[PDB]
Write a protein that binds this ligand. Structure first.
Ligand SMILES: CCCCCCCCCCCCCCCCCC(=O)OC[C@H](COP(=O)([O-])OCC(O)COP(=O)([O-])OC[C@@H](COC(=O)CCCCCCCCCCCCCCCCC)OC(=O)CCCCCCCCCCCCCCCCC)OC(=O)CCCCCCCCCCCCCCCCC
Ligand SMILES: CCCCCCCCCCCCCCCCCC(=O)OC[C@H](COP(=O)([O-])OCC(O)COP(=O)([O-])OC[C@@H](COC(=O)CCCCCCCCCCCCCCCCC)OC(=O)CCCCCCCCCCCCCCCCC)OC(=O)CCCCCCCCCCCCCCCCC
Ligand SMILES: CCCCCCCCCCCCCCCC(=O)OC[C@H](COP(=O)([O-])OCC[N+](C)(C)C)OC(=O)CCCCCCCCCCCCCCC
Ligand SMILES: CCCCCCCCCCCCCCCC(=O)OC[C@H](COP(=O)([O-])OCC[N+](C)(C)C)OC(=O)CCCCCCCCCCCCCCC
Ligand SMILES: CCCCCCCCCCCCCCCC(=O)OC[C@H](COP(=O)([O-])OCC[N+](C)(C)C)OC(=O)CCCCCCCCCCCCCCC
Ligand SMILES: CCCCCCCCCCCCCCCC(=O)OC[C@H](COP(=O)(O)OCCN)OC(=O)CCCCCCCCCCCCCCC
Ligand SMILES: CCCCCCCCCCCCCCCC(=O)OC[C@H](COP(=O)(O)OCCN)OC(=O)CCCCCCCCCCCCCCC
Ligand SMILES: CCCCCCCCCCCCCCCC(=O)OC[C@H](COP(=O)(O)OCCN)OC(=O)CCCCCCCCCCCCCCC
Ligand code: HEC
Ligand code: HEM
Ligand code: HEM
Ligand code: FES
Lengths: 385, 126, 93, 57, 247, 123, 93
């Protein structure tokens, strides 16, 4: 046999990359997983090369990030690459999750794959939060203050958990150094979780946009999907190069270039844009305990979706009502993000509460009823009786 | 996840009622025409996800000519959607051609598995 | 090594599909083909077919949610203006 | 003479990869020179060389 | 919130550097450093800009050295351990007017003037915001504005009441090149200089961006060709089906 | 827990410090301000408390500088009530620091503090 | 999955050793045994057997290098003393 099959490690690279049998009919939405791996390699490399210059003290965090932006050779390249690549990481992650929600990639074989994906989603949200708080701008300090003061709503040990996370009595020097140690650590937990994602993917193979079995027509991944993924790799690099070199501060809030002042509230405390729908699901509930419970349930309601998708065909490729309500869910998510960017004002509170209810009624109410109705319509449209 | 016996029960109730038939059957016919699986050469029982032991049982119990024809329709739909086209209009599956061929095998394997579970969980009346 | 559980995918030779008979595949060498064949016909015609097939599902929720967000934004700009402060204090208190 | 063309450049992969690397070297030098020339010529009047010539005159 | 609490949004001026192939007007940077030193240096600081970054942008080496020698910083203490002052050099930073925040607030009616190093990137609107904020001080505030003592009116400031008085009047700086220093000309020059203090990498960043966009777009189109080349053999496949004999 | 000496703070002045990342001020109140603080009916109060419940020393008013609407800083000795004025959304508090008019739901929070003669330990 | 190369270890059932006939294993339950049986006999007797068989290989080279190190240390301490400065400058220059 070949050396790519007989070796210990090259058999792994072969059975994952070179001979991995993909179905022939998958499209460019299946490129987002390889794109997320590319985003992770970009984030980890630019993160190490800025951690060689960053200082995590509360007097030197913002000054060291500005030292990267001014004194370090091509350090502006590394900083804008890290920041806008985190925004692109979350763009491609939302596309990966939405194509999973659409094409039914969460169903019966791949429930382990979907759940490990949700764990990666939680860890990546946490990494982005800690790294945003590492800059120690104005949005960093106050975002840290709000999101870690959320945990003082737990009635038993809320103050204990809060003063353990802070390392003191407010967000300060031990908080920022804690967050830097954790922001270095947690992406390697993400890399191990990506290897577990690849295991759960490899035991059953990819899905295809038809939803039907893909065992009949398959293609080895090398020389077909390598270049088919190279197309989107260069396209992702092109859009990221545009957003790094020509509009580098479009996806950033301009208040982060104010140094972190604990005595000044910046009149709109808002996190990064990819956490804004969860910030809106937070602020919709008029209680601090039920709000953070609803935000964690907003991340964790995707675990209910394998057992509520009552359909008998996989994926909304051939389902009219499921397609319509899937894009209603997608634009509800965009509305939720734009709502959470807004202030807490009169039409926005009711619109955010209604959009949160539609977000939770998609998985819990809309999907079982619509899929049952489509099962009945699919039966009686072709059974003659 | 929804059992095929339940879909058959609800659909037979809709079809046996004269009001529900004339109200919901054209909605389902237009739903199937909008669903567009016939433009790829698929009948509907090619679309059922087979990765469960009831469907593996029914596909094992399918006769061989239906198995070879289903294999060709699945491979043809994969190649058609690879090329990002549809089949030509004489290669579309006609309405009278879209017969449930896997459905008696699915319903029989479902009744066998439900009877096996019910006998696994009996309580003898003593 | 140890064997693992029953999966719905094998490897090259024992994929676990049906037995296939009578299905005959023909392909040509790409070196004897024209790549970028039909791209100007598909770019204006097949792309139009795909857009005609799949734009109501993507555009009617976009229309609903954008009209909702625009109407809410216009109501907010009416509320925090000078002409609607009576309604502002009424709907705030 | 596509046979001589292929036999010189694309038959041996060592000659192919060496040709690609030689072209990459030449393209790096030539491309950076042409981009800096086009950029500085597009922004004529705003550079420090032009401001320095104005202060000297 | 209200329009007065948001502040008036600053219009898009045709800046010389807006646009993907554009560079800072470095003569405008030199004039902006003149209007920084002669006006804005009495209340605002530039604690992030070293003297050595101005060499090759708005001044020369022997031209920056004279300003750095005009300021005085702390030295290493002498043999007896006494504190000692030193005439500054190219490695030192542009000094602020006040020793600390308490002295700044004592000099400026209780309000701290921010360090102007990153404020083009620290405010929404950016250069347009700085320009409209400097120029658009109304001589009279509009009728009914309850104004605090020592607070001036500016519409583009969020809240309407800014603690910075209008500081840019006509011909208060004699330019070196004879450029007629009106109010809006000096405001445009300091906005360009403060934008350079915010983004000193701007010119080289757009240059490497041009290189990068051309290289990556060419790689994208080359990769589309190579992908369709490799996929021709599968995309042009033909399946035929003669049904088998029943046995 | 910090200690602030009450000897260099004269009558009729404020002193605003930071403590655990939060602003906290001390006021040497006049007897006019003490009578004005105990001379407001609780019906005028959306969050009604008394001066004996809100300070331990009536001479020395000590409270946190967090406006209870969203966390802005009320300006020192500004407003229409003789107290403090949050300028972010127009919140007013008296010299006792209770909310009368504004979007603030509660009064200015009192920290925990004890006395050592002419100095205070807040913590 | 795909097969790996020819290895010299299988798993439980197909280890890759030879065929075995006639070798018969006997093993009684530890719950019927005495753990800590023989630990005092094997503490003083079996341990002396193992040490007696395997201490010359560990004690001749340790003694060689320890005597070499002690001799070098004593020569260095003699050299940088007052009695051996003539030999110090001689072997140093
Ligand atoms: C006007 C649109 C004209 C094209 C059109 O008719 O679209 C119909 C098309 C519907 O086609 P369909 O056959 O019903 O389904 C297409 C499948 O997605 C099949 O997908 P595909 O293989 O055709 O790829 C679809 C999409 C694939 O697009 C992506 O996957 C996005 C990749 C982005 C990489 C860089 C990401 C950077 C971060 C995010 C920004 O790329 C294209 O739309 C190419 C069109 C030529 O709608 C789109 O694909 C629009 C996608 C826009 C993104
Ligand atoms: C520094 C301090 C630690 C010093 C350790 C130096 C030696 C390194 C040994 C490396 C690890 C190891 O091999 O031990 C396994 C060895 C037994 O493992 P094995 O696999 O049967 O031995 C294979 C060897 O070839 C053994 O060869 P053998 O069978 O020819 O030699 C037999 C004998 C060799 O003779 C000796 O070791 C003389 C000593 O070893 C023993 O069987 C001694 C067993 C003593 C175990 C007593 C169990 C006490 C449990 C009750 C205590 C409960 C605590 C209170 C609980 C309170 C709860 C609230 O245990 C020891 O060697 C014990 C070493 C001395 C420990 C202190 C004895 C104090 C007794 C009280
Ligand atoms: C927590 C989970 C969140 C999850 C949600 C996160 C946000 C959403 C992420 C981005 C949207 C991802 C959509 C992925 C779904 C998809 O792949 O669409 C495919 C569809 C139809 O394709 P098909 O169903 O495979 O059919 C092809 C075969 N036929 C039958 C035609 C022969 O093709 C279409 O109908 C066109 C769809 C193209 C979608 C483009 C994006 C549209 C939405 C953009 C929203 C953001 C833009 C505004 C931002 C301000
Ligand atoms: C663009 C507007 C396209 C309008 C549609 C059209 O012009 O018809 C299609 C032709 C055919 O171009 P094609 O799609 O490459 O077909 C190749 C020739 N066959 C394989 C048919 C033998 O398309 C063309 O020949 C258009 C080529 C013009 C190139 C510049 C377009 C701007
Ligand atoms: C030096 C003394 C220890 C070595 C001398 C010796 O060999 O003594 C033997 C007995 C225990 O002998 P054993 O091997 O543990 O007994 C197992 C049961 N037999 C074999 C009798 C069937 O050893 C003893 O019973 C002595 C117990 C001494 C306890 C000292 C603890 C330290
Ligand atoms: C560097 C070149 C070293 C020698 C290459 C050679 O000489 O190639 C000889 C071997 C193959 O040998 P074989 O499988 O034909 O059989 C051996 C008995 N005749 O190539 C390889 O290692 C496999 C190449 C695949 C590498 C994939 C890498 C993916 C990870 C990224
Ligand atoms: C710091 C970074 C360093 C990276 C170095 C990694 C390579 C290992 C060196 C081996 C030295 C050696 O001795 O390799 C020699 C052996 C011989 O092979 P054999 O025993 O089959 O043949 C023996 C004949 N009887 O294997 C090789 O030929 C290795 C060549 C390919 C290397 C594989 C590429 C790495 C893939 C890693 C997959 C990762 C999965 C892990 C998930 C967390
Ligand atoms: C509980 C239930 C609640 C119901 C909630 C509402 C659900 C509404 C159903 C979905 C509405 C949008 C789908 C319309 C079908 C479609 O998109 O057709 C898209 C069609 C083309 O399609 P085609 O060529 O594939 O047609 C195959 C059949 N001939 O272009 C048009 O017609 C264009 C219409 C004018 C513009
Ligand atoms: C003297 C005192 C001066 C002079 C000569 C200038 N500024 Fe300005 N400035 C000053 C104070 C006390 C404040 C604080 C006001 C407040 O807190 O609102 C400011 C403020 C600014 C700002 C920030 C505005 C904002 O936060 O939205 C910018 C930007 C600013 N100042 C710029 C600026 C420029 C470009 C000048 C050029 C000559 C300038 N100031 C002069 C005090 C003073
Ligand atoms: C999982 C991938 C990662 C994500 C999603 C991520 C996300 C982020 C984000 C959003 C920021 C703020 C950027 C800004 O606005 O300026 C940031 C900052 C930072 N990250 Fe990461 N990061 C990742 C990996 C890493 C790793 C592995 C390291 C360390 C080796 C690292 C080091 C840094 C540092 C030093 C900063 C400080 C501010 C800066 O220079 O940008 N990052 N991170
Ligand atoms: C660091 C982040 C991630 C990486 C690197 C990653 C990587 C991959 C890769 C390479 C694939 C195979 C290619 C593909 O099908 O697209 C894949 C498949 C999949 N991933 Fe992810 N993934 C990540 C995050 C997630 C998330 C957040 C989810 C959603 C919960 C998820 C769910 C899935 C699913 C369901 C599949 C199977 C899709 C299918 O085959 O139909 N993954 N992932
Ligand atoms: S924060 Fe004090 S008034 Fe709103």
């Amino acid at each position: 046999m070949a050396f790519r099959k007989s070796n210990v490690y090259l058999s792994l690279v072969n059975s994952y990359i070179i001979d991995s049998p993909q179905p022939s009919s998958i499209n460019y939405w299946w490129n987002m997983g390889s794109l997320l791996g590319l985003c992770l390699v970009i984030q980890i490399v630019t993160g190490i090369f800025m951690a060689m210059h960053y200082s995590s003290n509360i007097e030197l965090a913002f000054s060291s990030v500005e030292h990267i932006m001014r004194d370090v050779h091509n350090g502006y390249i590394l900083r804008y690459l890290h920041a806008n690549g985190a925004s692109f990481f979350f763009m491609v992650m939302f596309m990966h999750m939405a194509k999973g929600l659409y094409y039914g990639s969460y169903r019966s074989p791949r429930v382990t794959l979907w759940n490990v994906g949700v764990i990666i989603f939680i860890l990546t949200i946490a990494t982005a939060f800690l790294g945003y708080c590492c800059v120690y701008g104005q949005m960093s300090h106050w975002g840290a203050t709000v999101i870690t003061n959320l945990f003082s709503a737990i009635p038993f040990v809320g103050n204990d958990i809060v003063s353990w996370l802070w390392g003191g009595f407010s967000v300060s020097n031990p908080t920022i150094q804690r967050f830097f140690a954790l922001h270095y650590l947690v992406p390697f937990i993400i890399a191990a979780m990506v290897i577990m994602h690849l295991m759960a993917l490899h035991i059953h193979g990819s899905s295809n946009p038809l939803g039907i079995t893909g065992n009949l027509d398959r293609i080895p991944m090398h020389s077909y999907f390598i270049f088919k993924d190279l197309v989107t790799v260069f396209l992702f690099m092109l859009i990221l190069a545009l957003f790094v070199f020509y509009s580098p501060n479009t996806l950033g809030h301009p208040d982060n270039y104010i140094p972190g002042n604990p005595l000044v509230t910046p009149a709109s405390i808002v996190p990064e844009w990819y956490l804004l729908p969860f910030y809106a699901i937070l602020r919709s509930i008029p209680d601090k305990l039920l709000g953070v419970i609803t935000m964690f349930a907003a991340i964790l309601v995707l675990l209910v979706l394998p057992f509520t998708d009552r359909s008998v065909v996989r994926g909304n490729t051939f389902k009219v009502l499921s397609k319509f309500f899937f894009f209603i869910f997608v634009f509800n998510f965009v509305l939720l993000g734009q709502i959470g960017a807004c202030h807490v004002e009169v039409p926005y509170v009711l619109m955010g509460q209604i959009a949160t209810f539609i977000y939770f009624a998609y998985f819990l109410i809309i999907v079982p009823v619509i899929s049952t109705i489509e099962n009945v319509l699919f039966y009686i449209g072709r059974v003659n009786k | 996840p929804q059992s095929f016996t339940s879909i058959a029960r609800i659909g037979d109730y809709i079809l046996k009622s004269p009001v529900l038939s004339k109200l919901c059957v054209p909605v389902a016919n237009q739903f199937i025409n909008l669903a567009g699986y016939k433009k790829l050469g698929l009948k509907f029982d090619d679309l059922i996800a087979e990765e469960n032991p009831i469907m593996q049982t029914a596909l094992r119990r399918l006769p061989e000519d239906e198995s070879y024809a289903r294999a060709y329709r699945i491979i043809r739909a994969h190649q058609t959607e690879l090329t990002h086209h549809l089949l030509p209009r004489n290669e579309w599956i006609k309405a009278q051609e879209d017969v449930p061929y896997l459905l008696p095998y699915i319903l029989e394997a479902e009744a066998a598995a439900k009877e096996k579970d019910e006998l696994d969980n009996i309580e003898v009346s003593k | 090594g140890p064997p693992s559980g029953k999966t719905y995918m094998g490897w090259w030779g024992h994929m676990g599909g049906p037995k296939q008979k009578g299905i005959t595949s023909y392909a040509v060498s790409p070196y004897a083909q024209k790549p970028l064949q039909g791209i100007f016909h598909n770019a204006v015609f097949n792309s139009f077919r795909r857009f005609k097939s799949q734009f109501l599902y993507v555009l009617i929720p976009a229309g609903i949610y954008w009209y909702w967000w625009k109407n809410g934004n216009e109501y907010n700009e009416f509320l925090y203006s000078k002409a609607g402060r009576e309604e502002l204090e009424r709907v705030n208190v | 003479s596509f046979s001589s063309l292929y036999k010189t450049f694309f038959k041996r992969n060592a000659v192919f990869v060496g040709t690609i690397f030689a072209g990459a070297f030449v393209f790096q030098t030539v491309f950076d020179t042409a981009i800096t020339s086009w950029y500085e010529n597009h922004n004529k009047g705003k550079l420090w060389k032009d401001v320095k010539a104005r202060i000297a005159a | 919130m209200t329009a007065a609490e948001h502040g008036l949004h600053a219009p898009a001026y045709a800046w010389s550097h807006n646009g993907p192939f554009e560079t800072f007007d470095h003569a405008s940077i030199r004039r902006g450093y003149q209007v920084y030193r002669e006006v804005c240096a009495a209340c605002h600081s530039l604690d992030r800009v070293a003297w050595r970054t101005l060499v090759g942008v708005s001044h020369t080496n022997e031209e920056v050295r004279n300003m750095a020698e005009e300021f005085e910083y702390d030295d290493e203490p002498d043999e007896q351990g006494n504190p000692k002052k030193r005439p500054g050099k190219l490695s030192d930073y542009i000094p602020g007017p006040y020793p600390n925040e308490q002295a700044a607030r004592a000099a400026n009616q209780g309000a701290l003037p921010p360090d102007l190093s990153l404020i083009v990137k620290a405010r929404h609107g950016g250069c347009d915001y700085i320009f409209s904020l400097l120029t658009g001080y109304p001589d009279e505030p509009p009728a009914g504005v309850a104004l605090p003592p020592g607070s001036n009116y500016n519409p583009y400031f969020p809240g309407g009441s800014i603690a910075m008085a209008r500081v840019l009047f006509d011909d208060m700086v004699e330019y070196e090149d004879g450029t007629p220093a009106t109010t809006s000309q000096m405001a445009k020059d300091v906005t360009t200089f403060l934008n350079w203090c915010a983004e000193p990498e701007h010119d080289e960043r757009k240059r490497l961006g041009l290189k990068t966009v051309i290289i990556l777009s060419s790689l994208y189109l080359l990769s589309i060709w190579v992908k369709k080349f490799k996929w021709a053999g599968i995309k042009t496949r033909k399946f035929v089906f003669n049904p088998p004999k029943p046995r | 827990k910090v200690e602030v000496n009450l000897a260099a703070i004269p009558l009729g002045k404020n002193v605003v410090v930071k403590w655990q990342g939060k602003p906290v001020f001390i006021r040497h109140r006049t007897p006019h301000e003490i009578q004005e603080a105990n001379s407001v009916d609780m019906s005028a109060l959306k969050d009604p408390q008394t001066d004996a419940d809100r300070v331990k020393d009536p001479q020395w008013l000590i409270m946190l500088g967090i406006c209870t609407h969203l966390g802005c800083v009320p300006i020192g000795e500004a407003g229409d009530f003789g107290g403090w004025f949050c300028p972010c959304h127009g919140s007013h508090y008296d010299i006792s620091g209770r909310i009368r008019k504004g979007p603030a739901p509660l009064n200015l929070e009192i920290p925990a503090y004890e006395f050592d003669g002419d100095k205070v330990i807040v913590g």
